[PDB]
Amino acid sequence: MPVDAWIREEVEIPEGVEVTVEGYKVKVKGPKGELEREFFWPGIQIFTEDGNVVIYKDFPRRKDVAIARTFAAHIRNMIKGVTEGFTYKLKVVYSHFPISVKVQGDEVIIENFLGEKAPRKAKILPGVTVKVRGQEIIVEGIDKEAVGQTAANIEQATRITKWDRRIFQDGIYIVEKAGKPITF
Amino acid sequence: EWKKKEVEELANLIKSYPVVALVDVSSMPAYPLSQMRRLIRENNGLLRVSRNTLIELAIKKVAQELGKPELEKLINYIEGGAGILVTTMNPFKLYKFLQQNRQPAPAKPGAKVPKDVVIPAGPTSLAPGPIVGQMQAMGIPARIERGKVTIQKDTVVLKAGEEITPELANILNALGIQPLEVGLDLLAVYEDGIIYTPDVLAIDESEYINML
Amino acid sequence: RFPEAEARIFKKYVCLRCGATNPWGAKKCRKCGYKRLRPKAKEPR
Amino acid sequence: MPKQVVEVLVEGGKATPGPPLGPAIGPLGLNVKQVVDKINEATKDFAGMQVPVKIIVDPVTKQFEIEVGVPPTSQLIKKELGLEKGSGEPKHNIVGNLTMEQVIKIAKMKKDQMLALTLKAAAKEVIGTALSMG
RNA sequence: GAGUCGUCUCGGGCGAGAGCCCAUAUCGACCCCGAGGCUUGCUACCUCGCUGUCGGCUCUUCCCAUCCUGGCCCUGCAGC
RNA sequence: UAGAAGCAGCCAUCCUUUAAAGAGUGCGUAACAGCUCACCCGUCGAGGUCCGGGGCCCCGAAAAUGGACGGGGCUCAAGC
Numbered sequence A: 001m002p003v004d005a006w007i008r009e010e011v012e013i014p015e016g017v018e019v020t021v022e023g024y025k026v027k028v029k030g031p032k033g034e035l036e037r038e039f040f041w042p043g044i045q046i047f048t049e050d051g052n053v054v055i056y057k058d059f060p061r062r063k064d065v066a067i068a069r070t071f072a073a074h075i076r077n078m079i080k081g082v083t084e085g086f087t088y089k090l091k092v093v094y095s096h097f098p099i100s101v102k103v104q105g106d107e108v109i110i111e112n113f114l115g116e117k118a119p120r121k122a123k124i125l126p127g128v129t130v131k132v133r134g135q136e137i138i139v140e141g142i143d144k145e146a147v148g149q150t151a152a153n154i155e156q157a158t159r160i161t162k163w164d165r166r167i168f169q170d171g172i173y174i175v176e177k178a179g180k181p182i183t184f
Numbered sequence B: 001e002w003k004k005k006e007v008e009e010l011a012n013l014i015k016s017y018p019v020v021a022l023v024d025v026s027s028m029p030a031y032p033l034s035q036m037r038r039l040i041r042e043n044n045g046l047l048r049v050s051r052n053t054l055i056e057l058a059i060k061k062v063a064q065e066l067g068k069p070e071l072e073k074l075i076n077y078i079e080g081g082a083g084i085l086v087t088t089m090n091p092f093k094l095y096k097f098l099q100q101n102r103q104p105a106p107a108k109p110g111a112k113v114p115k116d117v118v119i120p121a122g123p124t125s126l127a128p129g130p131i132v133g134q135m136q137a138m139g140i141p142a143r144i145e146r147g148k149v150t151i152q153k154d155t156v157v158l159k160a161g162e163e164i165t166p167e168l169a170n171i172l173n174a175l176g177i178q179p180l181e182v183g184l185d186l187l188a189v190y191e192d193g194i195i196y197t198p199d200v201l202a203i204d205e206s207e208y209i210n211m212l
Numbered sequence C: 001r002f003p004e005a006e007a008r009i010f011k012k013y014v015c016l017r018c019g020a021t022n023p024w025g026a027k028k029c030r031k032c033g034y035k036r037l038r039p040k041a042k043e044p045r
Numbered sequence D: 001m002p003k004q005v006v007e008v009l010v011e012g013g014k015a016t017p018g019p020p021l022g023p024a025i026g027p028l029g030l031n032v033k034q035v036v037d038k039i040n041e042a043t044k045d046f047a048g049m050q051v052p053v054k055i056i057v058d059p060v061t062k063q064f065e066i067e068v069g070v071p072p073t074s075q076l077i078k079k080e081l082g083l084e085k086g087s088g089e090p091k092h093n094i095v096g097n098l099t100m101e102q103v104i105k106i107a108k109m110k111k112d113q114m115l116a117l118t119l120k121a122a123a124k125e126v127i128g129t130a131l132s133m134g
Numbered sequence E: 001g002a003g004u005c006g007u008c009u010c011g012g013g014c015g016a017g018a019g020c021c022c023a024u025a026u027c028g029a030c031c032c033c034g035a036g037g038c039u040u041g042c043u044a045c046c047u048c049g050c051u052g053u054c055g056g057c058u059c060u061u062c063c064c065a066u067c068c069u070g071g072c073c074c075u076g077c078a079g080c
Numbered sequence F: 001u002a003g004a005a006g007c008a009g010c011c012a013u014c015c016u017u018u019a020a021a022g023a024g025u026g027c028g029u030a031a032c033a034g035c036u037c038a039c040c041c042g043u044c045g046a047g048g049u050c051c052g053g054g055g056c057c058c059c060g061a062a063a064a065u066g067g068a069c070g071g072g073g074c075u076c077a078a079g080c
Helices: A062-083 A144-157 B006-015 B032-042 B057-063 B091-100 B130-138 B166-175 B198-202 B205-211 C002-008 D018-024 D035-043 D073-081 D100-110 D119-131
Strands: A008-012 A018-021 A025-029 A034-038 A045-049 A052-056 A086-093 A100-104 A107-111 A120-123 A128-133 A136-141 A171-174 B019-024 B046-048 B082-087 B117-119 B142-145 B148-151 B155-158 B185-191 B194-196 C013-015 C020-022 D007-011 D050-054
Touching: A008 A062, A018 A045, A025 A062, A034 A062, A052 A062, A062 A144, A086 A144, A086 C002, A100 A128, A120 A144, A128 A144, A136 A144, A144 A171, A171 C002, B006 B057, B006 B082, B019 B091, B032 B046, B091 B185, B091 B198, B117 B166, B130 B142, B130 B148, B130 B166, B194 B198, D007 D018, D007 D035, D035 D050, D073 D100, D073 D119, D100 D119
Parallel strands: none
Antiparallel strands: A008 A052, A018 A025, A025 A034, A045 A052, A086 A136, A086 A171, A100 A107, A107 A120, A128 A136, B019 B082, B019 B185, B046 B082, B117 B155, B142 B148, B185 B194, C013 C020, D007 D050
């Protein structure tokens, strides 16, 4: 099990992303927008030491080392968030009634969900943009977290739990996440 | 295990054969290679591995300079799934044998292809299906002949140093033709204090002596 | 239709110490340890 | 196939099985069971056992490429022992034993089918097939 | 009524076993450990210069280990 | 047994050869085919995965006027 005792990690940043700290809060600014996050752990200093952002605490514990690596991964997703967007594709597939998925406002509305005269809805955050092209639907946007939430909110609304789950199966599902979610 | 148990056992192995070569045995499965593997065994040689025994050349150099030394094999050559091939076959026989058995290649889409990828003309021997639709999309003529899907004419789809894409690879696969044309590469061949490489094995010295 | 739906919905595990659909890599709810637990769906599976 | 058109079984002591050969039909040479006729004689041994082989049914220039089941090692040892079964009830009877000369005759012809590199190595394969039957 | 908790009520752990096959869709023995004060009983602490019984009626408070309504999960959940 | 061709089931579970192979882990097929694992070498270029005692803290934990640590309030302590 991990041989740390400093504990100190180092996070590699290019010259194409600059990062500036002011307290225990990290802001990452690159070509395409910027994104700020708050990393909230107590007793840990996050600071920029030259070209590298370093996350450290003097007293190592098993719990602190997990938190340090999670924060380090968050900066990396932010880095590849501020260079280029993340794309998840979802497909709408249906059991009987053609099903019309359009974005009206800052919510996606789905109508003709099993012949329904009522909406199913899922929230679409401003950092994420949702475009519908036929019955492929693409959730796209700056940050991996924003993109992950927006896409998943769409699947859960349409989610079948009200009847049989092997025979009633109409709804829009996560065809791409970055593999094929999710099985046992 | 322990170091220099293995290197020693290999040290001994190397002296026994006149010709010791390093080849990349990572390119090929497994029925093709295995029928060749068997064939080598009958014709006086064997193939071997273990994790770190294609390095520690210093003991091998000390053991002799006619096997695998550091003399010309300066760099300690350990490639991803390389093996060491010991044989009686002279480097020129060894080289030629190797160029002929090499095929079929695996499918690994997204590689840069070391050799040309072609589509031929003729029947696939597969029935009407989405396979006619794919061929048309690439702009490869087709027709139904034999009640089967047929190509009306070939064309060379990609060159060396060009990637096979997954869409392209998938078409090569549906056809049941490999997208890749890699097989066993010889990194280098050693015999009796001289290193043979494909450029060495290719020319012959006496042809220059004879003209001049 | 079919293999999209049954994945997001159905490709998970259940723990018969909690009576709730938990992650598949989990052997617990979030805590309840192990007894000797097994699927979820039986007869057709 | 899933009623056995490509996949076909031919007997090593009898000829024209009804189940693969009747549904698949069509002239492949002149019949499905043209190839069949060729196979049964060559593979034939004491035991009439089911020898997997393949045909490819294409009606349309009467095209086929076929494999030739060269008789298996299992089938060959039946002939030498004199039993067309291993045991009449799985693993409660005699699997038999071969004298030294008979195992070598089998290996000799088998060599080419086997992965081997000497003729001793082959004979160890055949003797081992003998011991575990049932 | 207090004390008490054998009796009673209820829970948890282990899982023999049947459910075509598959312990847990469902049902669940042997055994072991708690909780409650709602049955029964034990206690003789409190009252014999009286603290009047039960049931109904009427009128009201509180509690959940929840019958229904709301929101949820599984299934040996096709639908119903 | 039509098929049991690793994969209805029963028992055996042997031998040669190695990036690599279990008379085969699961899927799949009427049974095959096909998809795939353990496994291995190698890249990432490290200290790696374990198991076993102890202390503590969590889960296990459902009750009837508002009752609880004496009360307030207290989480680098006013806690152990």
